[PDB]
Amino acid sequence: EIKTTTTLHRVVEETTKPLGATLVVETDISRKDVNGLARGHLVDGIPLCTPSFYADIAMQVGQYSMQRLRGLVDVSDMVVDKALVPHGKGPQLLRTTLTMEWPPKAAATTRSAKVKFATYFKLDTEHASCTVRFTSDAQLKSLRRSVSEYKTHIRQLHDGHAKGQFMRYNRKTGYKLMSSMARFNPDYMLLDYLVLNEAENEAASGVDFSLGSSEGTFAAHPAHVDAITQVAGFAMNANDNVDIEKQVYVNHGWDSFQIYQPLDNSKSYQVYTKMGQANDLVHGDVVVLDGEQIVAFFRGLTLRSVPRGALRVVLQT
Amino acid sequence: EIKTTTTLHRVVEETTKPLGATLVVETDISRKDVNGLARGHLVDGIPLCTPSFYADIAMQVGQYSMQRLRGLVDVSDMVVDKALVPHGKGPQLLRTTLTMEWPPKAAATTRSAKVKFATYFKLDTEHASCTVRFTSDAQLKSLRRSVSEYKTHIRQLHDGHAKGQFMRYNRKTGYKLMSSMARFNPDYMLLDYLVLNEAENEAASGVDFSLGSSEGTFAAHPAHVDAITQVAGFAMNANDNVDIEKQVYVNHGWDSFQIYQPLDNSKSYQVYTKMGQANDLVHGDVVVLDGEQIVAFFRGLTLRSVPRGALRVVLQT
Ligand SMILES: COc1cc(O)c2c(O)c(C(C)=O)c(CC(C)=O)cc2c1
Ligand SMILES: COc1cc(O)c2c(O)c(C(C)=O)c(CC(C)=O)cc2c1
Numbered sequence: 314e315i316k317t318t319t320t321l322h323r324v325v326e327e328t329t330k331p332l333g334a335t336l337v338v339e340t341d342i343s344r345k346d347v348n349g350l351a352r353g354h355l356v357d358g359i360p361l362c363t364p365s366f367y368a369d370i371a372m373q374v375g376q377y378s379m380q381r382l383r384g385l386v387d388v389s390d391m392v393v394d395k396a397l398v399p400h401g402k403g404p405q406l407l408r409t410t411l412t413m414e415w416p417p418k419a420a421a422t423t424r425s426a427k428v429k430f431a432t433y434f435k436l437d438t439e440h441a442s443c444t445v446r447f448t449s450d451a452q453l454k455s456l457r458r459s460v461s462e463y464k465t466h467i468r469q470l471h472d473g474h475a476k477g478q479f480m481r482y483n484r485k486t487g488y489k490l491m492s493s494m495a496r497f498n499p500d501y502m503l504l505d506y507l508v509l510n511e512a513e514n515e516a517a518s519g520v521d522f523s524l525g526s527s528e529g530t531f532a533a534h535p536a537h538v539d540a541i542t543q544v545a546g547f548a549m550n551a552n553d554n555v556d557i558e559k560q561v562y563v564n565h566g567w568d569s570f571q572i573y574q575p576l577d578n579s580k581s582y583q584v585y586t587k588m589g590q591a592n593d594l595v596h597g598d599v600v601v602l603d604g605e606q607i608v609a610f611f612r613g614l615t616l617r618s619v620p621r622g623a624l625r626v627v628l629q630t
Numbered sequence: 631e632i633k634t635t636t637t638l639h640r641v642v643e644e645t646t647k648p649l650g651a652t653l654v655v656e657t658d659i660s661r662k663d664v665n666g667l668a669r670g671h672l673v674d675g676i677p678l679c680t681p682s683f684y685a686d687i688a689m690q691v692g693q694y695s696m697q698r699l700r701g702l703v704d705v706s707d708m709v710v711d712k713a714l715v716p717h718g719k720g721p722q723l724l725r726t727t728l729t730m731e732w733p734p735k736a737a738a739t740t741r742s743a744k745v746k747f748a749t750y751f752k753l754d755t756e757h758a759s760c761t762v763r764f765t766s767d768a769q770l771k772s773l774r775r776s777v778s779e780y781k782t783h784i785r786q787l788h789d790g791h792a793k794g795q796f797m798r799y800n801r802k803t804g805y806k807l808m809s810s811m812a813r814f815n816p817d818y819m820l821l822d823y824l825v826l827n828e829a830e831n832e833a834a835s836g837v838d839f840s841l842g843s844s845e846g847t848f849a850a851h852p853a854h855v856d857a858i859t860q861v862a863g864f865a866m867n868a869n870d871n872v873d874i875e876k877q878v879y880v881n882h883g884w885d886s887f888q889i890y891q892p893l894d895n896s897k898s899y900q901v902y903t904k905m906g907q908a909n910d911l912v913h914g915d916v917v918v919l920d921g922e923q924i925v926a927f928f929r930g931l932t933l934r935s936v937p938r939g940a941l942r943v944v945l946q947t
């Protein structure tokens with residue numbers, strides 16, 4: 314039976330059939346243990362749930378599904394369509410629906426599940442979707458072979474900063490730079506330092522989970538995983554040629570997300586990304602290291618350029 | 631008779647006397663050539679006239695007063711008491727009142743005049759005051775002897791940045807850093823780069839007056855002089871330990887201000903300040919160089935720590 318957590322509160326429905334299964338879980342984002350955490354970012358005084366919030370729940374229903382059938386869960390094909398504003402005024406029910414389909418009777422052969430995230434009063438808004446994948450360790454093995462190359466990019470960023478070539482932002486100064494666009498729940502302000510090579514939207518950052526409070530139970534703490542994606546959002550938005558009064562880069566989702574080691578709330582990690590240039594979309598990979606160890610990887614993290622002013626409008630609509 | 635300019639529109643009253651004289655001038659800050667200029671900073675969508683606007687008028691009425699009795703005018707003892715919001719909705723008449731006092735027949739020996747700045751509809755608000763002084767060149771001579779020393783502080787700041795010790799902000803990134811506190815009329819965005827030693831609130835900045843448009847006639851262009859004081863305000867507000875969502879440093883005035891060379895709108899200048907350490911107030915000197923030449927100097931520029939939120943309240947009321 315699925316363990317309830319800070320971010321997954323009850324099972325609404327759990328049905329097996331011959332050609333598939335449906336699992337519906339529910340999270341009251343107004344519940345007092347989670348409401349604070351659900352309010353990750355703040356834009357024009359409007360609180361916003363981060364994609365990492367869905368990713369946590371996805372990892373949970375995926376891990377459960379994968380164990381129930383028989384291993385790494387990949388939160389893949391994440392698409393964030395509509396803002397979720399945790400109002401904190403009476404129940405606000407986020408329903409996460411996981412569906413699986415199969416041949417008879419190869420249920421145990423199943424390597425993916427479709428996941429949808431929608432708030433209910435019933436239906437309020439459909440927010441996001443992803444596909445969880447029960448994946449191989451092939452990527453992990455490949456990442457392990459590239460560790461030394463990632464470490465080299467990181468070292469070269471620090472060397473450049475030490476020569477006056479690249480900007481290095483202390484934690485509070487980085488958040489100040491972003492503050493006309495978004496403010497952050499303090500528990501999400503986990504970027505300790507960030508070195509940015511603006512020419513390639515390329516960043517090396519120390520993320521220190523000890524800098525926030527992360528009480529509760531999770532598969533992947535939404536603050537910890539949002540801090541990882543913040544590094545790529547900062548690389549884009551902190552470029553001297555991006556005028557954040559007019560245009561801002563927002564997280565649209567990603568192609569793949571795997572976690573290989575605990576995201577420990579007493580530890581700091583190294584995060585490296587080269588986003589680059591590219592319609593209204595940029596994409597790139599984000600790796601998380603713990604010294605020599607591969608901790609996590611976003612493949613094809615996607616940020617969308619949106620008008621600052623029209624963002625304001627839609628969020629107030 | 632006093633030359634009218636972009637920032638001084640008409641003489642309201644001009645009386646000489648046995649024991650002194652009164653000169654009252656008027657500037658309609660809604661007039662189309664000046665209204666843009668008058669709106670130098672923007673806080674919470676509220677436009678604000680900068681202290682440099684009063685300093686320009688002070689130099690003009692001071693130079694005139696000095697010339698008509700019988701070379702440097704010092705805009706000294708500047709105190710900025712109340713915000714001036716150029717609404718641009720019908721006339722908004724800034725009245726600058728200069729008063730002088732003297733012995734019988736000794737008018738020619740007069741070395742200072744009291745200046746007050748108040749808007750009228752009639753009395754609206756009293757904004758600021760200063761004392762213009764007809765001063766010696768002793769300070770100028772002293773500054774010329776320190777040139778090499780100022781240049782050394784500047785070179786040391788650049789050296790430190792080249793070793794990764796001090797922050798260097800490109801123009802647009804500096805203004806992005808300040809943007810949750812204030813936005814700036816583009817004609818005021820003249821800070822080309824700034825290197826900051828946060829430990830001592832110590833900055834060297836290139837200010838490039840060619841970066842804005844400054845059409846009109848002035849004694850000292852309000853954008854150009856404000857850009858000089860921005861270097862000190864930035865030094866304080868860009869400190870990692872100053873949370874601009876809570877407290878901001880605002881210009882309160884200064885003890886002395888002298889200009890020794892034209893502030894040429896095609897030229898860039900070097901500005902150096904060491905504000906140092908946080909009562910309500912910080913103070914320090916700001917020097918302006920053009921290579922080897924002394925161009926201008928604020929002695930005892932004063933910034934006041936004000937609550938960001940309570941700043942908002944007052945301005946909105
Ligand atoms: C206008 O469309 C959207 C939709 C979203 O889901 C959005 C969203 O989730 C966010 C979030 C979570 O931050 C933002 C603002 C940022 C990047 O800080 C803006 C959004 C804007
Ligand atoms: C609350 O009291 C004041 C009085 C002023 O005259 C103020 C003032 O002139 C200003 C400005 C800009 O001129 C400001 C805001 C800043 C530093 O950008 C804030 C002010 C705040």
